[PDB]
Structure formats: C-alpha cells, structure tokens
A paper describes a structure:
Nevertheless, after further 3D classification, a cryo-EM map reconstructed from a smaller class of particles reveals a complete version of HGF II that forms a tripartite interaction with c-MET II and HGF I. The structures of the NK2 segment of HGF II can be superimposed well onto that of HGF I, suggesting that no domain rearrangements occur in this structural segment. However, as compared with the structure of HGF I, the K3, K4, and SPH domains of HGF II undergo a large structural relocation with respect to NK2. In the 1:2 c-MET/HGF complex, the SPH and K1 domains of HGF II contact the SEMA and PSI domains of c-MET, respectively; while the K2 and K3 domains of HGF II also make weak interaction with the N domain of HGF I. Additionally, two well-defined cryo-EM densities were identified in the N domains of both HGFs that could be attributed to heparins. These two heparin molecules are bound at the same site within the N domains of two HGFs and are surrounded by the same set of positively charged residues. Notably, weak cryo-EM density was observed between two closely adjacent heparins, suggesting that the two heparin molecules are likely to be part of the same heparin polymer. Hence, a long heparin polymer could crosslink HGF I and II by simultaneous binding both HGFs and thereby stabilize the c-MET II-HGF I-HGF II tripartite interaction. In a small subset of particles, HGF II becomes rigid, and contacts both HGF I and c-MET II, with the help of a long heparin molecule. In this particular conformation, HGF II binding strengthens the interaction between HGF I and c-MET II and thereby stabilizes the entire c-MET I/HGF I/c-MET II complex.
Residue numbers in the entry:
A (entry chain E): 26 to 106, 110 to 301, 311 to 626, 634 to 680, 687 to 738
B (entry chain A): 34 to 55, 59 to 290
C (entry chain D): 34 to 55, 59 to 288, 303 to 383, 389 to 429, 434 to 469, 495 to 722
The structure:
Amino acid sequence: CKEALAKSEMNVNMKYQLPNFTAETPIQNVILHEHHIFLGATNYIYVLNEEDLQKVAEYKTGPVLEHPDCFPCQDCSSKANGVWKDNINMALVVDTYYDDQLISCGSVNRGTCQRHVFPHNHTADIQSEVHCIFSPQIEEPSQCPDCVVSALGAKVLSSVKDRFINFFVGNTINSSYFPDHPLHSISVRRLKETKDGFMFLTDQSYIDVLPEFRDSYPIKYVHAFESNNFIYFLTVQRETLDAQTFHTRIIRFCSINSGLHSYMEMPLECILTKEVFNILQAAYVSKPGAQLARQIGASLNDDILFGVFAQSKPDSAEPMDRSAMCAFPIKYVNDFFNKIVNKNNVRCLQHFYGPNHEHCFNRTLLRNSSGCEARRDEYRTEFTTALQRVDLFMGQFSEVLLTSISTFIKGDLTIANLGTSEGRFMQVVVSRSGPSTPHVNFLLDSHPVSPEVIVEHTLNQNGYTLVITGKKITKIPLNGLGCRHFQSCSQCLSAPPFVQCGWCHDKCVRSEECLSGTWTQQICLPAIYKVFPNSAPLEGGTRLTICGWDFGFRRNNKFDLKKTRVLLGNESCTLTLSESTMNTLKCTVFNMSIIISNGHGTTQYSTFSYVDPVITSISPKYGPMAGGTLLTLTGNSRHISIGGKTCTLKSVSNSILECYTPAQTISTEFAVKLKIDLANRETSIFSY
Amino acid sequence: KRRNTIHEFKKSAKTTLIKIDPIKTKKVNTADQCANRCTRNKGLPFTCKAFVFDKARKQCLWFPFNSMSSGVKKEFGHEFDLYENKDYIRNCIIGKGRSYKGTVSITKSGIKCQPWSSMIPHEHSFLPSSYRGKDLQENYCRNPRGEEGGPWCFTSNPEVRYEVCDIPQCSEVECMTCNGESYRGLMDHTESGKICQRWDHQTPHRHKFLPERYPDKGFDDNYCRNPDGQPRPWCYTLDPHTRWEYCAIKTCAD
Amino acid sequence: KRRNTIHEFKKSAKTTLIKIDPIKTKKVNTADQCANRCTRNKGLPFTCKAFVFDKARKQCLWFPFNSMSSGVKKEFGHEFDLYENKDYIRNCIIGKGRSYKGTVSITKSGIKCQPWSSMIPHEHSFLPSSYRGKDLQENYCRNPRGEEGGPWCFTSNPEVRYEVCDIPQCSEVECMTCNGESYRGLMDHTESGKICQRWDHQTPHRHKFLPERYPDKGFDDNYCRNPDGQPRPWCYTLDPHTRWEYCAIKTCTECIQGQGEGYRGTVNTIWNGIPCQRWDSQYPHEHDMTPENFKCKDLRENYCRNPDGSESPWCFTTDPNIRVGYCSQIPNCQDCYRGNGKNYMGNLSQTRSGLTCSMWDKNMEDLHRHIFWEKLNENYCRNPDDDAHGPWCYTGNPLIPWDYCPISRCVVNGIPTRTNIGWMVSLRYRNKHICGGSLIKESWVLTARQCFPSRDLKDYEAWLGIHDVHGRGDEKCKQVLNVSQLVYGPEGSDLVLMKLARPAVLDDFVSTIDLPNYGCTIPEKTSCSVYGWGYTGLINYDGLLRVAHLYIMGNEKCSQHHRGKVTLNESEICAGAEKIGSGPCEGDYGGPLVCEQHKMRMVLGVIVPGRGCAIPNRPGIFVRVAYYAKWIHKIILT
C-alpha cells in the first residue's frame, strides 16, 4: 500500500521561525559590509543589523519628477508642470579603496549614480553625507560618461586596478533609448579621483551594438564576476539574430582600464544524458569541497562556476520550468578559449563589427601565442562550438524551475542553496556520484526567490545565507536548519553528518533529547506498516503485499535490496526480487507472527493467520435451471464456478458470499467447487 | 571450482619473457588454476595480462604486461611455458565485443579519442573507477557497457560527444580453402557462438586427438581446422551439452 | 574474513592488571578474537579500555579500564599478557581529528582540562549525555562535535571557560637515524598508509623473524624496525598481497629543494623515460658507483635521488649504454627570496614583451665590454648581473636590447611659481595637457604608467619650458617635440620613461635634474615640494604651474594616519602636509617630488594617484626613484 505508507516521505512543508525582515517594496540588490547589511529597494535604501535584521537606519530615495528639461541632479522641486516616476535600484556597491562609501545607482534619474559616506564613529548614518556623481561634459557634450546604468536591465562590477576604481557595467538597450541619450552594451568606467564624475578613457573602452540591431538582438546580462586577472560576464543572446532563439553566452576580457582589448564570447551549454538547456537563471562562483574536487577533476583551490541552466520556450527566452545545475571549472573555460577551439571555429563578432566587414573577411588570431597584449586593432570574436557540460543532479530537477543558487563547502562536501520559482529553498549535498535528496526543502514564500543571495561563512562552523524573496529577507543558518522533519530511518542516516542527529526507534531526533539511549546513526531496525492479506489457507501460497519502509540495507547511497529475507514460523516465504522495494515487499508463501530479516535488523509483525476455510450452507436447494438466480453461502482472494462457468460474484464476505448462478443446459443438481486459487471443499447439489 | 579460461589464453611453450625495467608469483600445481587466479576478479592485486608456468619448478609467475609492451626480452627457456591473452592481440570485434581491450584510439571519422581520465571536452568519462576491470586504458576505445553498437569513445573534437570506433571483425581477413584442412588460421568462432575446447586438455568432453601425437596438423590454442578433412572447419566444444561443432569461415578467391 | 581489530591493540608481556577497587572471563582459545570482540561494538557493555589473556588460563578477560586508571596493580605474571587499546595511550593525532580518542588533558595555556563530568565551574559539561560514542572522556579533551578547531576543553580556570588542545601527529614525532636500525618507535604504518602486522604473527606472511629468537631488536606489535639494514626501516604488510613495505619516518617529496641532494625521491623515471635500477643492484654494466652509493647516501631505494648532490638528480638507467640518467622531471619550488639572478637557474626563454631571448654568447662579449660587475647558460633569461629587479634576458632588436622575462619574484592649495622652470614636462594628448613629467637627459623624460591611456605615439606630444599650461603666458621657452619610444618599468613599478624623437637645446629656460644614490635614504622631516599642473581646487585657474611644499614622513606615520588602509611596501615613500590638506590630484600624475638634500636639489619621487585627494591631516604617497635608479641607468645606456 504505497500511498498509505507515503507518510514515510519527509514533510515537505513545515514552518520555521527565522529572522525575517519585510520591506514596503520589492528588494533588488543587497550588499554585506562591516556588520551592516544594506538593501536597495524600490524608492528606498535600508541598512540592517545582521543577527536581528532590525531596520536601524532608513534612507529614502524619493520618487522623482521626471521632466524633460530638468537636469539629473539639479533640484527641480519648484517645477509645477512632468510625472512622479519612481526609481528602482539596480546597482549597489561598496567602495573602501578611497573611503568607506556606498554607491547607489538609480533607474529613472537618467541612470546617474550617487555616493553615501560613512562617518568614522558611526557607520549606519548614511543619510548625513550624500553626493551625486555628475560632471557636465563641456568638452564633448555629445556623449555621456556619467549616464551610467540603463533601465531594462544591467549588471555592475567594481574593481581596483592600478589604484583606479573601475566600474565594468553592462546594460540592456532598447532602440528607443539611444538618440535621446546614448548608452553602451559593455563599458569600462574610471571614477575621477576627485569623486565628481567618470571618464571614458578611450572610444575603445566601450562596445555598443550597431545602430541597426538595437531593436532586434537584445542581450540581457545575468551575472558578472572577476577571476585570475580576467573579468568574465554571463549573458543570454540569440546564436543568430535571424534565428531568434536565445542561448547562454560567456564574455572574457582582461581588466586593463584603457578598454576591453581581449574580448571573447563563447557559447555555454549544459546537456543531460542529449537534451540541451539554452538558458541560465543564476550563477555563483565558489571554491569546491574535497569530494567534488576530483569528481570534476579540479584542484581544491581553483575557482568554480555554478550555473542553474534551464530549458526555455522554443524560439523564445521564457524559461520552460525545466532546470539543471552545472559546474564549470574556470581553468577548463580558459583553456577552451585559448586552444581547445581552433581558428575554423572562431568568427568575427556580429553585433559590433557587422555582418560584412574587412575584419570579418580575414585576420590572424594571436589567440594561443598571446594572452591580452593590448592591441590598437583589438579583434571582436564570437566562437561557435559551445562548451558542453553535463548535469550534476542527472536531471532530478527536470520538472521544477530553479531561480537562485549559492554554494559553500563543509567538511569535504559542497552544498547548494538552491531556490525555486515558487519560493521553496532547498539545500542539497551535491555530487555526481549519487542522487542525493535535499536535507532542507521547506517553503519560504509565495514569490520567486531572487538570484541575489548574500552568504557569509564564519570560522567555518557558524555561517548564514541571506536570501531575498519578493519583499522578504531571511537569515538561514547553513549549519542544518533542522532534522526534525525526517521520519524514515534511511533518510535519518542519509542526512549528512554535519547535522548531528540520529534515529532513536521512532523518529529522527537530535541526540540529547530522547532518553531511551537507543539514539543511533549507523544501524537501525526496519519498520512494517501493514500486511495484505492476513488470511491464508494451509495450501495457499498467496500474494502478500507488505507495506513498510527501511526494507533495503542502508549503504552510503545505493540500497542493497538483496540483504533481505522473510521468515514465517520456521519456513521462509518466497521472496521475489522484481517486486521487493525498500518501499514494499511482495512475497508468496492459528495466528502466527511473521518475521522480516534484513542486512541490519529483524522486525516482528503479529498480524498474520493460517485460517482454515469453512463452507457450510447454500441457497437455494431445489429450483429451476434458468441460470440467473442468486446463491447465498457462508462459513469461515478466491473464485467460484460450476460446470466450467464462473458465477458473477454478487457479494463478498468471510461469512456471507453471494453469486449469480451460471446458466447450464441441464436439469439436475451439482456439487459446486470453490476455487480459491485452489479447489477447496466443494458444496452440495442444487436442483437446476 | 576452476574455469579453463585457457580457452581464452594464448599458448607459446619453451620460451620465457623478462622485463628488467623497475611482479607476483604463486605456487600452484596447474597452469589452469594459476590462470584461474589471474581470471578471478579482485583476486589478483595486479592486472596480469600474461603469465608463465613450469611444471618442473612447481611455481607460476604472472606478468601485468604482455610481449607487446616495450622492455620485454624473449628467450628460449624450454621449461617455461608462456600464457598470453589473445583479447589484447585480437584487434578484432566479436559481436558486442564487451571484452575488447585492443589499442585503437581512432574513430571512424578520424578524430582522436579523448582520454577516459580527462574531463575535457566530455565529462561522462567518470568510468575509469566506475567499472573495475574495464581495462579502459589511457585513450583506447572500449565497450564498458557491452553496448551493442561497438566500442565507442569520446572525441577530442568538442562538437561530437561520442563516436564508435569502426573495428574490423576477425572473420574479414579469414578465408577458407574449399577443403579447409589446408587453411591454418586464427579464428576461434563456431556457428553457434561458442569457443572451442582445448586440444591438449581433454576436459570436460573427452576427444581422441592430441596435438603431440598429430603434430604439424596444428592443434594449437583452440583453432577450428579439419583434423580429418571435413568440408569446413570444426572442433570439440567446451560445452558439456554439445560434443562437437563446425566453425563458419567465408571463402577467398584468386 | 570474520573480524580483525587485534592489530589495533597493543600488548605487553608477563604482566597482569589488578584493579583493587572495581567484567567477565570466558574460556576462549583466541586472545586475538578476544580483542576483536572488545573492539567490536556491543561486545561488552562496560568500556573495554584494554584486555588481558593468559594462555595457561585460556580464559578471556577484557579490562574496562587502563593501567593509567588509578589504583591498578600490575603483577609480573609470566602466563598473563596485556593488550592495550593504542587509541587512548598513544595520545598522538593520526589522520582525522574527527574521532580523537587519546588521553590528553592539558590546555594550550597549560591548564588541566576539567573533568567533563564536573559542572564546576562551567555550565556545559553534560556533553557525554549530549553526545555518546564520541568518547567524551572524564577529563581528557576530545572533539565533541567534530569541530574544526578540535578538542576544546572547558578549562578548570575561573577566567576562561574553555581553552583548546593541540595534538601533534605521531609521524612527525617519530624519527629515525641514517642507519635507522637503532631507532625504536611506536610508528606502525608503512609508506602507503598500510599497517605492519604483529611480529609474533605468522599470517598473512610467515617471514623469518621470530621476535623471541631475534630479540633485542624491538620486534614488538607492529612497530617498524630495520632488521635487514635498509636505509629506511620496513615491515611485512598486513595485506597478504603486499610482501612488505618501507616505513615513512623523518630524520632525527616531489617539489625539489636545492640540487636535490638532501632531497629524496620515489621516482626513478628520467626525461628519456628510462626507469632506473636500484643502488642495491649493480645492473646493468656492473658500475662500481652502486657499492659507493651505499656509503654516499644513507637514504636510498630502487627509486632515484642525489647521493652525490649533482645538479640534476641522477640514477642508473636500465639502458646499459647510459651509466647515469638525469631525473630532471621532478619540479622545484616561480622565484621567491632570490632577487639575485645567480641564485635562480631560470629555465625559460621568453621576455615580458613577447620576444625570445637571443644567443647568449654575443651578449656576453658585448656586456663584458660594457657592464663591469666583476659562464651562464646560452640563451636563457637567468640574469647574470644579480640585478635588484631579478631575472632578465637579452633581445636582438636594437630598440629593446634587453628586457625581463616575466616570473614571480620575492595641486590643491598650492602657490603659483613666479619663475620659469625647466624640469617640468607638459605632456599633450590630442593637443591638450594630460600630465606633467620630469626632464632627465637631453632626450629622456620620467613619468608614470597611469598617464598613458593609449600606447600610440602618433598622438602624444611633449612640450618643455612653459609657465602656462596652455602656453598663452609665454612661448620663447616652449619646446615642441614628438615622442620616439616608450619604456615600461619593472613589474609592479607603475613607473615609465619616454624618449624623444629629437634632443633639445638646454639653457636656463629648460633644465634637467639629477637622480638619487642607489640607496639614497631621505632624512625624516626633510622639507621639499611638488610642482603641479592639476585642477588645484580652483573655480578658475589662469594656468600657472602651482607649487606645494611638503615634509617627508616615515612609513609608520602614514600607517597611523591611514588606519591600516595602506600596506606599505619597500618601494614607496610617504610625505605629508602638516596640519593642512594640500596635495597633488588629477593632472599631477608623473609630477616630480624634488628634495634638496645637502646643497643642491634632487628628485625623489613621482606623483601617482592613491587613497583619496588632498585629505587634511593625511599624508601623501609616492614611488621612490631610488629603488629604480639603477634600472634607469641600465636603460639609459640605450
């Protein structure tokens, strides 16, 4: 009875009290810094203490009149003619190279940024000093060095090269936005040291999609990170603009402020096996645990890129809610760019250089022989042979959309802070070696999990993971949010050791609570729920379903369904492999106790009997032969028939059986023989 | 208690092999049981692709290396009787060829095979530890699942994941002159897909011919010939059920 | 099969333990199965800390206590033999600390870690009840949670609740001498993590040594000994398949140290791939070197090392023709602590820029003609001259004679100037000023890396001899010159020189400045000034070059002012305005910090951007030319 014993499966939905902070508006970005945790949110900036998430200081970025002639950071409150638009933060960074400051980067106000300064004694008081970055470009007013961030979507990454705060920013551009005020697809900004503007060091410092492909070929960037003297980006663009099918891409260029000299795109795909996922939902860069190190072949110290690849509606960007997560050891990707693909695979880069150009026609690639040497004739490149990865979960998530991921290490295992589209926050001990079941699978909130997650691990034993869902910021102790939810012994033993708890005879429980001292984590007895049926004739070796759990020997991952046997009295009932599961048994053999022996423990169930059948009375006695009359029998999985024809069973009971007599072209009476899998004692004759 | 895996082993007598290039020896009465130790899985901590027996020393030594390797020296030590495993020297496919160990690293379309150790460009190569005794070496293409299509390997070429190495069957270079007894060949494949019985041993089916009493008619290894000139070649079977069966060989011309 | 944890037990001879203040005795044939039962979980309810068997008795009596337990009397009874649980007595870390079960009760500050049954004085003592199976000892510190930090014991001390414990690995504690046979130790593991069998045993190997027959060599339990005089002690393996193995003991790896002499290696393969014969075996050509090797190195095997301390580790190739094959494949710990070239034999042939090194010999001729420092390899970038900046190479091309091969190694509030000035070099990018620079020789200027957005020279244009950043003030001294070539400094320098298309006439209007002595170290509190072409924090600046005085401060003083935001390195100087905020900012990069030492004035630094702009009561940070003056000389010889 698989349904009934499903109570063995863990309670997916249990409610937890964790430090939960709520905002008035949706939260987009969050940054952790010096024992304060700032949040950007629609029209507002919130700074909160960690361990309580008390909104200590609030600074409000007011909704701002947008009027065409009102300049960005000049004050046009006096204007009476033109709409009270609102701003949504898309870039919140912290700088400490210059001074301990926060930088916010608004949406509506032409995408011009402002910086808050931390006083020395007190750091939360951000509202005190606020300065808006802005420099009237008198020299070349035609271009914006200060109109930084777009509206549709952007990613911003701060860095300190050469004693130089550089913002690498990517924007999404609609065709309409340009002629009013230009922007750029990927660009490199120097902050002017006097902290009152940005400069474009060279026309080379930026790349903008050519004027014609603005409305078509939109690229939206999904992640941006730095490693190994390189600044990678992760975006999603159609392989061919005409094809209109979006696919995941990666961007590489060394961090020279002069501009993006070594600019290389590569396609990235993760397949399952050959189903290929063309969309990426989120990514996180981390170092791997010891176990995974060899298992993907990476050294323990190398950077690793985790991405939740998802299948997408065909010929469209919308995810289909089928997902995967896949690991890309950064050394592998760098080798792929430099030598794994040859010149034949390489091409020019369409959206910037153009479909037809002198550069596209012919050019040597100093791809292997040189790494990043600044070239005045820098070449824009687009590869074509996607870097194929395979799933880490082997598609155990093939039906549920993933939206946010993070990863930390612990012991030797490595853990993923997965998040789905409907607000469930799993944690999985990830390994290609074994399909491992999440040890936390509670539902967080109705709204989808945001990809922006801040995780801090302290002293390797106390850490936490801020996650953002809708309007909610929550602190989850990665240390194992609990183990009360486990109810199946196998599950109790499968939960990774970093959460100290083990079975004590009835439920997975922390060690120091249940007194019986039966608390164990290595070996435990199997549990039987029920048995069907318990009425067996002496000759009947009949199909007995056994409902229970922990019916398999518990080894790391694989369950040894082979170290199982059934003892009935003294004989052993006939155990059949293909129908024996750690879920259920299907065996085929004066109340008697059945005993079930496994590789670990033996359980005793008293619900069995060797009942001896009885039949005594039949109705009718004398009658006609029409073959439609009902028959009533009585006495103590069967079948009943007369003259080679089975009577339809009108009714069933232990003590009252009703059958409709079959029609027989004869006028005499017959003793009727019961066939309960076996011809047991026949009854007497009834006059047809 | 023992298996005549010698039906698989390759025999050359009155010879010896040494590799002095920096080895396990166990005392058994029969080369068959020493081969049995080599055949037993996990039983041998080293992967012996050969071994020599001498009845005289009552000792057997087992080499984790065949004569095909470099650094081996071949000498006339008459008491020593070599034992190879023709599976490596096969360079042929037998059906699915689940037990194919040969050293071919090229595919049909001519792109190199990816090493099974390196995860680039294909990460489904985690098999070197998954299947013990797959003999899956550095690069050469095998059939670890015994999948029907043939020995396949992953290509260094990023686009194509796996492609099956084309490998010609042993039959293709084997013909039979109409008599067959003149043909002195290399096959060991009957029509019913069974491997011949060892001539020199008489177990389990007991047959009349011994190679020593009829030398130069080549009763060596288990090679289907015509000992008495039947139309097409034949041998006694290892199989307890069938006494003897033919072997099917195509014909050649010119 | 069955079970075999007797090996994990110790033993002692002819002693019986009598606990005066207290267990079962069973006629069992095998004291080994007895110990296995004691190790096996659920065999005994009580805590079987050891066992004793008397084969005269043949009665199996496990002991749930140590001899270190108080009050137990040992008794010299021949028939009785003890078997101790080496976990508790060894008290040394072995592999993971996750399951520490050793009797150590001492804090890091040398206090007795309290009885864990003692609530006094610290609350959290219910740890054995909270965690069972962790061997949460009476008083000895044990990891309770498998904490990273390890056994942390609630110190009996009133002030500190708990203080941590540190257990050394047994392998580091154990050491052997070059002979090794004289060494006696409790180490019982082979070189492959395998375990030695019990000397008394005859399984799985029935070797020759009977410890009673050959006593006096310490053949007890599984302890590694040198019975056959190998350079390392060795034992027969508990695994039947492995005949025997060497034991890893340090003296009383791969990456190479020095010429590999003290280094020792387990790899006999070379660059030709030929495996190498043992120093024990004279094979192949019966070389007399192999007997000499036994004396030459007291650490040896079939593997390859450096008994003679050759430059590349050597062995005897199985190839009879070749007597010695160099094991140069093993790596050497890519330069650190040797900024001197000769200390580094650099195996590389490619410079910073991208040009390959040339045939060293012509360069040795030319350099011996030129350079006067006082046989190094052909065409490898090891530098001969032991220069300060490290390894460097020669290039054929004239414009760049030589360059380093890339390796790892170990104004606002100012005054206008009343008078025309010569050191000032006005750098002009698309015909506007971008930075100031210093005039060194008649065709050479000194500037900063930060000031060259483009590498192109078709656009840069230098002016000399100017009082107004646009030149509207004066033109007689304005000297317009193209730019010939750019030369970058060492790596991590942020320093650059640029050389002119043509020389200049030098007169009063245009002047050069000398350079410091190689270690020229400024006195603290010395006064000197910067000259700047920057914004000057002025609503309008007419375009006069602006001067700002300054005083040198120690690196320590700037560490204090910057509050640890500066991690001061050797090459920098820090000079800071006193009680006033005035400093160079945008436009001043490449500007000269010139300090009058004794009678004349001399340049010391370059103005470079860092940590803020003109911050009051905060110093300024520059690059000291002294650390690079020699490099300036070598390059100026081009």
